[PDB]
Design an enzyme around this catalytic site. Structure first.
Site, PDB file in Angstrom:
ATOM      1  N   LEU A 148      -8.888   4.073   2.648  1.00  0.00           N
ATOM      2  CA  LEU A 148      -9.837   4.704   1.743  1.00  0.00           C
ATOM      3  C   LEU A 148     -10.763   5.663   2.513  1.00  0.00           C
ATOM      4  CD1 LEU A 148     -11.554   4.841  -0.989  1.00  0.00           C
ATOM      5  CD2 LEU A 148     -12.944   3.062   0.093  1.00  0.00           C
ATOM      6  N   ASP A 165      -6.201   6.686  -4.953  1.00  0.00           N
ATOM      7  CA  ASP A 165      -5.695   5.329  -5.006  1.00  0.00           C
ATOM      8  C   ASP A 165      -5.748   4.897  -6.465  1.00  0.00           C
ATOM      9  OD1 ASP A 165      -8.275   4.350  -5.600  1.00  0.00           O
ATOM     10  OD2 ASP A 165      -8.549   3.392  -3.690  1.00  0.00           O
ATOM     11  N   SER A 186     -12.144 -19.919  -6.297  1.00  0.00           N
ATOM     12  CA  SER A 186     -10.818 -19.790  -5.691  1.00  0.00           C
ATOM     13  C   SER A 186     -10.836 -20.201  -4.217  1.00  0.00           C
ATOM     14  CB  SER A 186     -10.305 -18.350  -5.740  1.00  0.00           C
ATOM     15  OG  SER A 186     -10.001 -17.959  -7.058  1.00  0.00           O
ATOM     16  N   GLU A 210       0.820  -1.205   0.000  1.00  0.00           N
ATOM     17  CA  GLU A 210       0.000   0.000   0.000  1.00  0.00           C
ATOM     18  C   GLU A 210       0.860   1.264   0.000  1.00  0.00           C
ATOM     19  OE1 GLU A 210      -3.057   0.057  -0.640  1.00  0.00           O
ATOM     20  OE2 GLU A 210      -3.954  -1.812  -0.006  1.00  0.00           O
ATOM     21  N   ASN A 223      -6.881 -19.670 -11.027  1.00  0.00           N
ATOM     22  CA  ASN A 223      -8.223 -19.085 -10.906  1.00  0.00           C
ATOM     23  C   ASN A 223      -8.212 -17.646 -10.334  1.00  0.00           C
ATOM     24  OD1 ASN A 223     -11.044 -18.829  -9.300  1.00  0.00           O
ATOM     25  ND2 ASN A 223     -11.289 -20.064 -11.147  1.00  0.00           N
ATOM     26  N   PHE A 238      -8.559  -6.547   2.821  1.00  0.00           N
ATOM     27  CA  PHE A 238      -8.128  -5.182   3.049  1.00  0.00           C
ATOM     28  C   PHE A 238      -8.288  -4.367   1.769  1.00  0.00           C
ATOM     29  CE2 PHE A 238      -5.564  -2.302   5.769  1.00  0.00           C
ATOM     30  CZ  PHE A 238      -5.153  -1.354   4.834  1.00  0.00           C
TER      31      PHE A 238
END
Ligand SMILES: [Cl-]
Ligand SMILES: [Cl-]
Length: 162
Positions: free
Chosen positions: A32, A20, A117, A11, A132, A104
């Protein structure tokens, strides 16, 4: 290495409001603020998050406090989710960190949509899960970060982060 260091790599840290990868007002370590195009809405979400009048700038301690809350919220989002929780419980500690990283970034609902998945992860079909996982808007929009997270689910090691 751990979830904190992993997300810090993925990040970054910026002390002033930024957009972002999706174009959304964000601050700190991927915190965010709002999806709205208004910088004034961002600043006001930010004062609310920090509890003071920031004018769009925060300290490192403040960025790290939001980060702690967000890692905590992501873990709790997994544990409260009926689709995420049993996959997470099935995983070793390194692969659990990859799951938190995903929640996250994209939220509980996003991740819970990786139905196939999740099942392959639960069954420990690591190479197949990896293939996948990559067939996703997630991987196409942020390929370097997604490759790191996928490799972590694939190998159960921190190799992609060293
Ligand atoms: Cl908050
Ligand atoms: Cl990326």
């Amino acid at each position: 290495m751990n979830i904190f260091e992993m997300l810090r790599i993925d990040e970054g840290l910026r002390l002033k409001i930024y957009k972002d990868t999706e174009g959304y007002y964000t601050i700190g370590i991927g915190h965010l603020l709002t999806k709205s195009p208004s910088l004034n809405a961002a600043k006001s979400e930010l004062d609310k998050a920090i509890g003071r009048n920031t004018n769009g700038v925060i300290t490192k301690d403040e960025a790290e406090k939001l980060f702690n809350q967000d890692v905590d919220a992501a873990v709790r989002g997994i544990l409260r989710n009926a689709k995420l929780k049993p996959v997470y419980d099935s995983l070793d500690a390194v692969r659990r960190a990859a799951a938190i990283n995903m929640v996250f970034q994209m939220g509980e609902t996003g991740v819970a949509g990786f139905t196939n998945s999740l099942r392959m992860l639960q069954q420990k079909r690591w190479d197949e899960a990896a293939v996948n996982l990559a067939k996703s808007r997630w991987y196409n929009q942020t390929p370097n970060r997604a490759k790191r997270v996928i490799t972590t689910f694939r190998t159960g090691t921190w190799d992609a982060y060293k």
